[PDB]
PDB file of C-alpha atoms and ligand atoms in Angstrom:
ATOM      1  CA  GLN A   1     115.819  98.631 144.096  1.00 37.29           C
ATOM      2  CA  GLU A   2     114.726  94.986 143.981  1.00 36.48           C
ATOM      3  CA  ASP A   3     114.063  92.407 146.410  1.00 34.41           C
ATOM      4  CA  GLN A   4     112.142  90.382 144.020  1.00 35.15           C
ATOM      5  CA  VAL A   5     108.521  90.704 143.939  1.00 37.23           C
ATOM      6  CA  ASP A   6     108.168  93.443 141.549  1.00 40.28           C
ATOM      7  CA  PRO A   7     104.298  95.318 142.570  1.00 40.56           C
ATOM      8  CA  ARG A   8     102.748  96.193 139.449  1.00 43.38           C
TER       9      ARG A   8
ATOM     10  CA  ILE B   1      98.755  94.760 129.212  1.00 40.63           C
ATOM     11  CA  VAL B   2     101.266  92.295 127.906  1.00 45.91           C
ATOM     12  CA  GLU B   3     100.728  91.095 124.027  1.00 45.98           C
ATOM     13  CA  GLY B   4      96.642  91.807 124.665  1.00 43.04           C
ATOM     14  CA  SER B   5      94.313  94.457 122.401  1.00 43.21           C
ATOM     15  CA  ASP B   6      92.547  97.133 122.851  1.00 43.48           C
ATOM     16  CA  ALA B   7      89.337  97.043 124.923  1.00 41.99           C
ATOM     17  CA  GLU B   8      85.868  97.367 122.812  1.00 42.03           C
ATOM     18  CA  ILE B   9      83.823 101.001 124.004  1.00 38.81           C
ATOM     19  CA  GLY B  10      82.558  99.859 127.323  1.00 37.38           C
ATOM     20  CA  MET B  11      83.757  96.175 127.242  1.00 36.86           C
ATOM     21  CA  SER B  12      84.529  97.064 130.877  1.00 36.67           C
ATOM     22  CA  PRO B  13      82.452  99.939 132.062  1.00 39.55           C
ATOM     23  CA  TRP B  14      83.336  99.039 135.715  1.00 35.08           C
ATOM     24  CA  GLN B  15      87.346  99.878 134.945  1.00 37.63           C
ATOM     25  CA  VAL B  16      88.508 102.902 137.202  1.00 37.70           C
ATOM     26  CA  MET B  17      92.070 104.916 136.634  1.00 36.91           C
ATOM     27  CA  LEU B  18      92.939 105.824 139.813  1.00 35.82           C
ATOM     28  CA  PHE B  19      95.116 109.004 138.562  1.00 36.26           C
ATOM     29  CA  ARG B  20      97.075 112.014 139.880  1.00 37.46           C
ATOM     30  CA  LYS B  21      97.090 115.029 137.441  1.00 40.69           C
ATOM     31  CA  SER B  22     100.413 116.745 139.029  1.00 42.40           C
ATOM     32  CA  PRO B  23     102.630 115.506 137.773  1.00 41.70           C
ATOM     33  CA  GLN B  24     100.820 113.885 135.437  1.00 42.27           C
ATOM     34  CA  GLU B  25     100.298 109.927 135.880  1.00 43.47           C
ATOM     35  CA  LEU B  26      98.641 106.736 135.590  1.00 46.52           C
ATOM     36  CA  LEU B  27      99.147 105.347 138.882  1.00 47.31           C
ATOM     37  CA  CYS B  28      97.101 102.013 139.381  1.00 50.31           C
ATOM     38  CA  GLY B  29      93.421 100.153 137.985  1.00 52.57           C
ATOM     39  CA  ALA B  30      90.868  99.554 140.186  1.00 52.53           C
ATOM     40  CA  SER B  31      87.114  98.688 139.692  1.00 49.90           C
ATOM     41  CA  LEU B  32      84.242  99.758 140.909  1.00 51.21           C
ATOM     42  CA  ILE B  33      81.614  97.327 142.880  1.00 51.14           C
ATOM     43  CA  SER B  34      78.618  99.641 144.056  1.00 52.29           C
ATOM     44  CA  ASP B  35      77.558 102.834 143.713  1.00 50.73           C
ATOM     45  CA  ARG B  36      79.711 104.732 146.850  1.00 49.56           C
ATOM     46  CA  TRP B  37      82.734 102.154 146.751  1.00 51.86           C
ATOM     47  CA  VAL B  38      85.895 101.154 144.712  1.00 52.56           C
ATOM     48  CA  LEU B  39      88.700  98.218 144.823  1.00 52.64           C
ATOM     49  CA  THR B  40      91.627  98.160 144.413  1.00 50.47           C
ATOM     50  CA  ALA B  41      95.665  96.721 145.319  1.00 48.78           C
ATOM     51  CA  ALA B  42      96.809  98.499 148.554  1.00 48.18           C
ATOM     52  CA  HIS B  43     100.360  99.045 147.136  1.00 50.39           C
ATOM     53  CA  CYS B  44      98.240 101.544 144.832  1.00 50.47           C
ATOM     54  CA  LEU B  45      98.103 103.547 148.046  1.00 49.31           C
ATOM     55  CA  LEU B  46     100.490 102.658 150.322  1.00 49.25           C
ATOM     56  CA  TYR B  47     104.176 100.965 149.680  1.00 50.36           C
ATOM     57  CA  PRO B  48     106.896 103.058 151.787  1.00 48.02           C
ATOM     58  CA  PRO B  49     110.014 101.802 149.839  1.00 47.34           C
ATOM     59  CA  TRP B  50     109.002 103.825 146.935  1.00 45.49           C
ATOM     60  CA  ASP B  51     107.463 106.893 149.546  1.00 47.86           C
ATOM     61  CA  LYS B  52     103.774 105.995 148.246  1.00 50.61           C
ATOM     62  CA  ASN B  53     101.275 107.052 151.108  1.00 45.63           C
ATOM     63  CA  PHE B  54      98.216 108.257 148.861  1.00 50.73           C
ATOM     64  CA  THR B  55      95.506 109.993 151.211  1.00 50.99           C
ATOM     65  CA  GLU B  56      92.061 110.432 150.038  1.00 50.85           C
ATOM     66  CA  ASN B  57      93.096 113.943 148.348  1.00 48.34           C
ATOM     67  CA  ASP B  58      95.887 113.469 146.558  1.00 49.03           C
ATOM     68  CA  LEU B  59      94.298 111.572 144.258  1.00 45.98           C
ATOM     69  CA  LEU B  60      91.309 111.525 141.997  1.00 46.72           C
ATOM     70  CA  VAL B  61      88.801 108.263 140.796  1.00 45.87           C
ATOM     71  CA  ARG B  62      88.085 108.450 136.900  1.00 46.10           C
ATOM     72  CA  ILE B  63      85.188 105.936 136.165  1.00 47.32           C
ATOM     73  CA  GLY B  64      84.227 105.008 132.215  1.00 48.74           C
ATOM     74  CA  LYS B  65      87.370 105.806 130.625  1.00 49.07           C
ATOM     75  CA  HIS B  66      88.234 104.752 127.304  1.00 49.64           C
ATOM     76  CA  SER B  67      91.820 106.619 126.368  1.00 49.43           C
ATOM     77  CA  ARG B  68      95.003 107.292 128.873  1.00 50.20           C
ATOM     78  CA  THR B  69      95.692 110.250 128.211  1.00 49.98           C
ATOM     79  CA  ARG B  70      92.308 112.433 127.465  1.00 49.61           C
ATOM     80  CA  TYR B  71      89.563 113.743 128.754  1.00 48.99           C
ATOM     81  CA  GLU B  72      86.845 112.546 127.787  1.00 48.09           C
ATOM     82  CA  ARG B  73      83.908 114.895 127.859  1.00 47.98           C
ATOM     83  CA  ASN B  74      81.034 112.836 127.733  1.00 45.55           C
ATOM     84  CA  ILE B  75      81.618 109.696 128.744  1.00 43.49           C
ATOM     85  CA  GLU B  76      83.609 109.813 132.045  1.00 43.68           C
ATOM     86  CA  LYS B  77      82.786 110.774 135.867  1.00 43.30           C
ATOM     87  CA  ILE B  78      85.508 111.444 138.016  1.00 43.41           C
ATOM     88  CA  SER B  79      84.877 111.376 141.233  1.00 42.16           C
ATOM     89  CA  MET B  80      86.896 112.179 144.675  1.00 45.71           C
ATOM     90  CA  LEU B  81      87.569 109.783 148.051  1.00 46.91           C
ATOM     91  CA  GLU B  82      85.703 110.491 151.279  1.00 42.54           C
ATOM     92  CA  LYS B  83      88.053 107.636 152.856  1.00 39.23           C
ATOM     93  CA  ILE B  84      90.618 105.174 151.947  1.00 42.07           C
ATOM     94  CA  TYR B  85      90.875 101.690 153.685  1.00 42.53           C
ATOM     95  CA  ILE B  86      93.733  99.244 153.576  1.00 41.56           C
ATOM     96  CA  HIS B  87      93.648  95.791 154.696  1.00 41.41           C
ATOM     97  CA  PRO B  88      94.784  95.917 158.007  1.00 42.04           C
ATOM     98  CA  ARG B  89      97.510  92.553 157.748  1.00 45.15           C
ATOM     99  CA  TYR B  90      98.674  94.103 153.815  1.00 47.35           C
ATOM    100  CA  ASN B  91     102.751  93.198 153.945  1.00 44.68           C
ATOM    101  CA  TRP B  92     104.258  95.693 151.978  1.00 46.49           C
ATOM    102  CA  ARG B  93     107.641  94.635 153.817  1.00 45.18           C
ATOM    103  CA  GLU B  94     107.550  90.662 151.929  1.00 46.34           C
ATOM    104  CA  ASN B  95     105.274  89.295 149.738  1.00 47.36           C
ATOM    105  CA  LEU B  96     102.344  92.133 149.409  1.00 49.42           C
ATOM    106  CA  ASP B  97      99.938  89.213 151.012  1.00 47.40           C
ATOM    107  CA  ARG B  98      96.330  90.730 151.613  1.00 45.65           C
ATOM    108  CA  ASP B  99      97.134  93.503 148.764  1.00 44.57           C
ATOM    109  CA  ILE B 100      93.615  94.703 148.979  1.00 49.83           C
ATOM    110  CA  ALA B 101      92.240  98.682 149.531  1.00 49.81           C
ATOM    111  CA  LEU B 102      88.920 100.110 149.776  1.00 47.76           C
ATOM    112  CA  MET B 103      88.211 103.697 148.301  1.00 45.25           C
ATOM    113  CA  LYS B 104      84.552 105.220 148.960  1.00 41.72           C
ATOM    114  CA  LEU B 105      83.455 107.883 147.149  1.00 40.04           C
ATOM    115  CA  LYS B 106      82.105 111.229 148.176  1.00 41.91           C
ATOM    116  CA  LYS B 107      78.971 110.564 146.305  1.00 41.47           C
ATOM    117  CA  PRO B 108      77.076 107.686 144.929  1.00 41.21           C
ATOM    118  CA  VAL B 109      77.266 107.383 141.080  1.00 42.35           C
ATOM    119  CA  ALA B 110      74.948 106.781 138.354  1.00 42.01           C
ATOM    120  CA  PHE B 111      75.333 103.520 135.999  1.00 43.60           C
ATOM    121  CA  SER B 112      75.753 104.392 132.843  1.00 43.00           C
ATOM    122  CA  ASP B 113      76.401 102.672 129.133  1.00 42.59           C
ATOM    123  CA  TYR B 114      80.037 103.085 130.416  1.00 43.35           C
ATOM    124  CA  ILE B 115      79.827 102.906 133.895  1.00 44.45           C
ATOM    125  CA  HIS B 116      78.599  99.810 135.952  1.00 43.57           C
ATOM    126  CA  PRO B 117      79.765  97.814 139.049  1.00 46.55           C
ATOM    127  CA  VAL B 118      81.184  94.481 138.187  1.00 45.27           C
ATOM    128  CA  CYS B 119      79.993  91.150 140.821  1.00 44.88           C
ATOM    129  CA  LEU B 120      81.588  90.205 144.323  1.00 43.24           C
ATOM    130  CA  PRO B 121      81.976  86.199 143.753  1.00 42.31           C
ATOM    131  CA  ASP B 122      78.922  83.902 145.814  1.00 41.06           C
ATOM    132  CA  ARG B 123      80.478  80.740 147.031  1.00 40.90           C
ATOM    133  CA  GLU B 124      79.168  78.993 144.379  1.00 39.06           C
ATOM    134  CA  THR B 125      80.421  81.448 141.287  1.00 40.01           C
ATOM    135  CA  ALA B 126      84.065  81.592 142.960  1.00 39.95           C
ATOM    136  CA  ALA B 127      84.494  77.562 143.628  1.00 42.57           C
ATOM    137  CA  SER B 128      83.156  76.767 140.421  1.00 37.83           C
ATOM    138  CA  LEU B 129      84.656  79.170 137.575  1.00 34.90           C
ATOM    139  CA  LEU B 130      88.415  79.911 139.855  1.00 35.17           C
ATOM    140  CA  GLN B 131      89.950  76.714 138.705  1.00 35.55           C
ATOM    141  CA  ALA B 132      93.177  75.698 136.655  1.00 35.12           C
ATOM    142  CA  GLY B 133      93.089  76.502 133.183  1.00 34.88           C
ATOM    143  CA  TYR B 134      89.489  78.029 133.239  1.00 33.94           C
ATOM    144  CA  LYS B 135      90.333  81.953 131.779  1.00 36.22           C
ATOM    145  CA  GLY B 136      89.461  85.174 133.548  1.00 37.53           C
ATOM    146  CA  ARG B 137      90.218  88.267 131.635  1.00 40.22           C
ATOM    147  CA  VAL B 138      92.535  91.317 133.260  1.00 39.61           C
ATOM    148  CA  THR B 139      92.114  94.967 131.666  1.00 39.45           C
ATOM    149  CA  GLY B 140      94.517  97.920 132.450  1.00 41.76           C
ATOM    150  CA  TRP B 141      96.136 101.417 130.603  1.00 41.03           C
ATOM    151  CA  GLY B 142      99.835  99.817 132.260  1.00 39.03           C
ATOM    152  CA  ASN B 143     103.196  98.632 130.762  1.00 39.14           C
ATOM    153  CA  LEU B 144     102.886  97.382 127.243  1.00 42.09           C
ATOM    154  CA  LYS B 145     106.199  95.229 127.648  1.00 39.29           C
ATOM    155  CA  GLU B 146     108.732  94.848 130.765  1.00 38.42           C
ATOM    156  CA  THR B 147     110.348  98.083 131.220  1.00 39.49           C
ATOM    157  CA  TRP B 148     113.163 100.270 133.225  1.00 39.28           C
ATOM    158  CA  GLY B 149     106.124 101.764 126.529  1.00 43.40           C
ATOM    159  CA  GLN B 150     102.304 102.546 127.304  1.00 43.01           C
ATOM    160  CA  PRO B 151      99.064 102.172 124.960  1.00 41.09           C
ATOM    161  CA  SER B 152      96.353 105.182 124.003  1.00 42.38           C
ATOM    162  CA  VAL B 153      93.726 103.558 125.017  1.00 44.95           C
ATOM    163  CA  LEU B 154      92.384 100.552 127.167  1.00 44.42           C
ATOM    164  CA  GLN B 155      93.923  96.872 127.201  1.00 43.13           C
ATOM    165  CA  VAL B 156      92.226  93.896 127.326  1.00 40.63           C
ATOM    166  CA  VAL B 157      93.807  89.919 128.020  1.00 42.48           C
ATOM    167  CA  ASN B 158      92.409  87.114 128.156  1.00 41.44           C
ATOM    168  CA  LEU B 159      94.578  84.439 130.518  1.00 41.78           C
ATOM    169  CA  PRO B 160      94.069  81.038 132.432  1.00 43.65           C
ATOM    170  CA  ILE B 161      93.935  79.896 136.108  1.00 44.88           C
ATOM    171  CA  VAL B 162      96.737  77.916 136.715  1.00 44.01           C
ATOM    172  CA  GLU B 163      97.450  74.982 139.528  1.00 42.27           C
ATOM    173  CA  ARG B 164      98.874  76.149 142.967  1.00 42.28           C
ATOM    174  CA  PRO B 165     101.779  73.647 142.664  1.00 44.00           C
ATOM    175  CA  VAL B 166     102.936  75.147 139.904  1.00 44.79           C
ATOM    176  CA  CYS B 167     102.648  78.989 141.336  1.00 49.02           C
ATOM    177  CA  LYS B 168     104.299  77.587 144.004  1.00 45.67           C
ATOM    178  CA  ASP B 169     107.424  75.921 142.000  1.00 47.01           C
ATOM    179  CA  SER B 170     107.413  79.133 139.451  1.00 47.54           C
ATOM    180  CA  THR B 171     108.675  81.824 142.264  1.00 47.34           C
ATOM    181  CA  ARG B 172     110.899  82.156 145.424  1.00 50.68           C
ATOM    182  CA  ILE B 173     108.832  84.640 146.710  1.00 50.00           C
ATOM    183  CA  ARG B 174     107.176  83.042 149.879  1.00 49.51           C
ATOM    184  CA  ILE B 175     102.918  82.859 148.531  1.00 46.32           C
ATOM    185  CA  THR B 176     100.141  83.038 150.532  1.00 48.12           C
ATOM    186  CA  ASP B 177      96.365  82.002 150.101  1.00 47.77           C
ATOM    187  CA  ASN B 178      95.198  85.233 149.628  1.00 45.82           C
ATOM    188  CA  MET B 179      96.446  84.477 146.139  1.00 46.91           C
ATOM    189  CA  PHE B 180      96.351  82.956 143.076  1.00 49.52           C
ATOM    190  CA  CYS B 181      98.943  83.058 139.388  1.00 48.04           C
ATOM    191  CA  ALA B 182      97.225  83.552 135.819  1.00 52.77           C
ATOM    192  CA  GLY B 183      99.378  83.052 132.568  1.00 54.97           C
ATOM    193  CA  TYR B 184     100.073  80.570 129.998  1.00 54.28           C
ATOM    194  CA  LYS B 185     102.913  77.622 130.470  1.00 55.15           C
ATOM    195  CA  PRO B 186     105.716  77.409 128.478  1.00 56.71           C
ATOM    196  CA  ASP B 187     105.097  74.615 126.786  1.00 56.05           C
ATOM    197  CA  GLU B 188     101.456  76.145 126.395  1.00 57.77           C
ATOM    198  CA  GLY B 189     102.903  78.526 123.854  1.00 56.11           C
ATOM    199  CA  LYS B 190     100.496  80.983 124.412  1.00 57.81           C
ATOM    200  CA  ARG B 191     101.398  84.410 125.759  1.00 55.59           C
ATOM    201  CA  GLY B 192      99.888  87.269 128.011  1.00 58.17           C
ATOM    202  CA  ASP B 193     100.731  89.154 131.404  1.00 57.27           C
ATOM    203  CA  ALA B 194      99.761  92.429 133.323  1.00 56.57           C
ATOM    204  CA  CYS B 195     102.500  95.360 134.381  1.00 52.91           C
ATOM    205  CA  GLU B 196     103.341  97.756 135.385  1.00 57.18           C
ATOM    206  CA  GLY B 197     100.083 100.325 135.645  1.00 57.20           C
ATOM    207  CA  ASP B 198      97.604  97.381 136.242  1.00 55.64           C
ATOM    208  CA  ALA B 199      97.722  96.728 139.916  1.00 54.44           C
ATOM    209  CA  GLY B 200      94.844  97.511 141.146  1.00 56.14           C
ATOM    210  CA  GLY B 201      93.203  96.184 138.880  1.00 59.24           C
ATOM    211  CA  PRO B 202      90.418  93.661 138.016  1.00 57.91           C
ATOM    212  CA  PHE B 203      90.687  89.888 136.955  1.00 57.99           C
ATOM    213  CA  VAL B 204      86.884  89.334 135.801  1.00 60.32           C
ATOM    214  CA  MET B 205      85.127  85.744 134.599  1.00 59.34           C
ATOM    215  CA  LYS B 206      81.582  85.839 132.844  1.00 59.01           C
ATOM    216  CA  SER B 207      79.285  83.533 134.737  1.00 55.81           C
ATOM    217  CA  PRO B 208      77.417  80.999 132.281  1.00 56.92           C
ATOM    218  CA  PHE B 209      75.130  80.682 135.447  1.00 60.09           C
ATOM    219  CA  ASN B 210      73.223  84.448 135.096  1.00 58.20           C
ATOM    220  CA  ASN B 211      75.523  85.574 132.085  1.00 58.82           C
ATOM    221  CA  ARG B 212      76.914  88.437 134.577  1.00 58.61           C
ATOM    222  CA  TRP B 213      80.655  89.252 134.834  1.00 60.40           C
ATOM    223  CA  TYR B 214      82.479  88.452 139.019  1.00 61.90           C
ATOM    224  CA  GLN B 215      85.550  89.914 139.573  1.00 58.94           C
ATOM    225  CA  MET B 216      87.669  87.116 141.287  1.00 56.36           C
ATOM    226  CA  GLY B 217      91.143  89.003 141.517  1.00 54.53           C
ATOM    227  CA  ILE B 218      93.211  92.211 141.131  1.00 55.56           C
ATOM    228  CA  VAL B 219      96.335  92.778 139.574  1.00 54.17           C
ATOM    229  CA  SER B 220      98.760  92.378 142.220  1.00 51.33           C
ATOM    230  CA  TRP B 221     102.689  91.510 141.245  1.00 50.08           C
ATOM    231  CA  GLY B 222     104.990  89.259 139.421  1.00 52.42           C
ATOM    232  CA  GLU B 223     108.602  89.072 138.464  1.00 53.17           C
ATOM    233  CA  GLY B 224     108.855  91.025 135.272  1.00 51.13           C
ATOM    234  CA  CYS B 225     106.334  90.674 132.798  1.00 48.65           C
ATOM    235  CA  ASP B 226     105.308  87.825 130.470  1.00 45.46           C
ATOM    236  CA  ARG B 227     108.350  86.017 131.409  1.00 48.18           C
ATOM    237  CA  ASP B 228     108.252  82.157 130.714  1.00 50.08           C
ATOM    238  CA  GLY B 229     107.917  79.384 133.389  1.00 49.14           C
ATOM    239  CA  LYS B 230     106.545  83.305 135.292  1.00 52.20           C
ATOM    240  CA  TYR B 231     102.584  83.587 136.487  1.00 53.33           C
ATOM    241  CA  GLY B 232     101.100  86.779 137.177  1.00 52.83           C
ATOM    242  CA  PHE B 233     100.088  87.286 140.602  1.00 53.78           C
ATOM    243  CA  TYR B 234      96.573  88.095 142.185  1.00 54.79           C
ATOM    244  CA  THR B 235      94.523  89.030 144.966  1.00 55.38           C
ATOM    245  CA  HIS B 236      92.385  86.437 145.771  1.00 53.51           C
ATOM    246  CA  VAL B 237      89.125  88.450 146.235  1.00 53.95           C
ATOM    247  CA  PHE B 238      86.371  85.580 147.558  1.00 51.86           C
ATOM    248  CA  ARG B 239      89.094  84.959 150.135  1.00 53.50           C
ATOM    249  CA  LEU B 240      89.317  88.520 151.396  1.00 56.49           C
ATOM    250  CA  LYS B 241      85.125  88.516 150.883  1.00 57.01           C
ATOM    251  CA  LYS B 242      84.859  89.226 154.430  1.00 56.98           C
ATOM    252  CA  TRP B 243      86.910  91.335 154.878  1.00 55.56           C
ATOM    253  CA  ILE B 244      85.070  93.765 152.474  1.00 54.82           C
ATOM    254  CA  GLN B 245      81.684  92.971 153.710  1.00 55.22           C
ATOM    255  CA  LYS B 246      83.015  94.114 157.441  1.00 54.75           C
ATOM    256  CA  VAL B 247      84.010  96.818 156.155  1.00 57.70           C
ATOM    257  CA  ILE B 248      80.858  98.194 154.134  1.00 59.76           C
ATOM    258  CA  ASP B 249      79.105  96.890 156.775  1.00 59.08           C
ATOM    259  CA  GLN B 250      81.102  99.289 159.561  1.00 59.32           C
ATOM    260  CA  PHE B 251      81.953 101.966 157.141  1.00 61.06           C
ATOM    261  CA  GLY B 252      79.504 102.467 154.779  1.00 60.85           C
TER     262      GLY B 252
ATOM    263  CA  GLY C   1      74.224  98.536 143.514  1.00 63.46           C
ATOM    264  CA  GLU C   2      74.726  95.581 143.873  1.00 64.53           C
ATOM    265  CA  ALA C   3      71.284  94.082 142.706  1.00 64.68           C
ATOM    266  CA  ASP C   4      72.832  95.040 138.732  1.00 62.63           C
ATOM    267  CA  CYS C   5      76.143  94.318 138.969  1.00 61.67           C
ATOM    268  CA  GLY C   6      78.162  92.666 136.234  1.00 59.48           C
ATOM    269  CA  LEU C   7      75.913  93.842 133.526  1.00 57.62           C
ATOM    270  CA  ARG C   8      77.135  95.352 130.172  1.00 57.88           C
ATOM    271  CA  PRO C   9      74.239  97.772 128.508  1.00 58.56           C
ATOM    272  CA  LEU C  10      76.249  98.186 125.331  1.00 58.85           C
ATOM    273  CA  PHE C  11      76.734  94.138 125.694  1.00 60.55           C
ATOM    274  CA  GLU C  12      74.518  92.011 127.499  1.00 61.16           C
ATOM    275  CA  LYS C  13      71.927  94.461 127.644  1.00 59.24           C
ATOM    276  CA  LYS C  14      72.067  94.121 124.174  1.00 57.67           C
ATOM    277  CA  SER C  15      72.717  90.479 123.589  1.00 55.00           C
ATOM    278  CA  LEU C  16      75.861  91.540 121.587  1.00 54.41           C
ATOM    279  CA  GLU C  17      78.699  89.354 122.110  1.00 57.10           C
ATOM    280  CA  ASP C  18      82.300  90.772 122.672  1.00 57.14           C
ATOM    281  CA  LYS C  19      84.798  90.059 120.745  1.00 57.40           C
ATOM    282  CA  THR C  20      87.025  87.645 122.764  1.00 61.79           C
ATOM    283  CA  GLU C  21      84.276  86.306 125.579  1.00 59.79           C
ATOM    284  CA  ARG C  22      83.915  83.050 123.812  1.00 62.66           C
ATOM    285  CA  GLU C  23      87.460  82.064 124.448  1.00 62.80           C
ATOM    286  CA  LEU C  24      86.000  82.599 128.161  1.00 60.62           C
ATOM    287  CA  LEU C  25      83.702  80.106 128.269  1.00 64.65           C
ATOM    288  CA  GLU C  26      85.297  77.267 126.030  1.00 66.75           C
ATOM    289  CA  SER C  27      87.915  77.469 128.684  1.00 66.76           C
ATOM    290  CA  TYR C  28      85.202  76.399 131.072  1.00 66.08           C
ATOM    291  CA  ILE C  29      83.008  74.036 129.304  1.00 68.05           C
ATOM    292  CA  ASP C  30      85.786  72.029 126.704  1.00 70.29           C
ATOM    293  CA  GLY C  31      89.744  73.489 127.204  1.00 69.32           C
ATOM    294  CA  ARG C  32      90.748  71.144 124.762  1.00 68.75           C
TER     295      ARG C  32
HETATM  296 NA1   NA D   1     104.764  84.112 131.904  1.00 68.26          NA
END
């Protein structure tokens, strides 16, 4: 699912 | 929080837990900034890629907490939301630019040993404390390590602010002036970061001028947690202070 | 709640330091 930014 | 330690009781009395009870989950951290207002990251409340769109009734704010998984009868305050204000230029599509939200509480809270608001920085405090190499403190109940591992008790870590050119070089994502980054460089040896479940929590610094704690940042995003050559990104509270003031002005 | 922001009744009000706050002050003054 990752579009690079990993929201915390 | 990765590579931190247990908070002492009452060490971070502005810490707020955003919590849903069914299904039982810690959503996010947040911070108390007056008797009636709570500050958090926009993506804690609105993130369409993960079907996240909370309204006032989907959420309870828990103040004065130390344990993650225990109702603390004689210390904690549970408040309900009257309104949620998400920053109008919050960008969930790309880079989480302006990852900030305000929550107005239904009734004012009274402060205590365990419940107290954090200061927002004035121009000098923001300027003088937010310098590369200067350390702030981040807290939360989120992951103790990168995983696809949670603590019983509030965690705390101290982390240095990083030069902007180094923050820029660390990542492929477009970053903005509304973000800063913190953590140790590879050749500084030391470790520590925020992680999943810590978002919305405060990055704080203690002013030597008046001995008060100020919130400089809001835990926003990273690429994994505590990786070499990578840094945590934080919403730049001072840069967005005008918006905060405008919202509290208009709707308070 | 503006006027008493950032003070901890269990710490600054009692003139007690927490276990790691000096690390912050050390970074503001020295850093080496
Ligand atoms: Na790192």
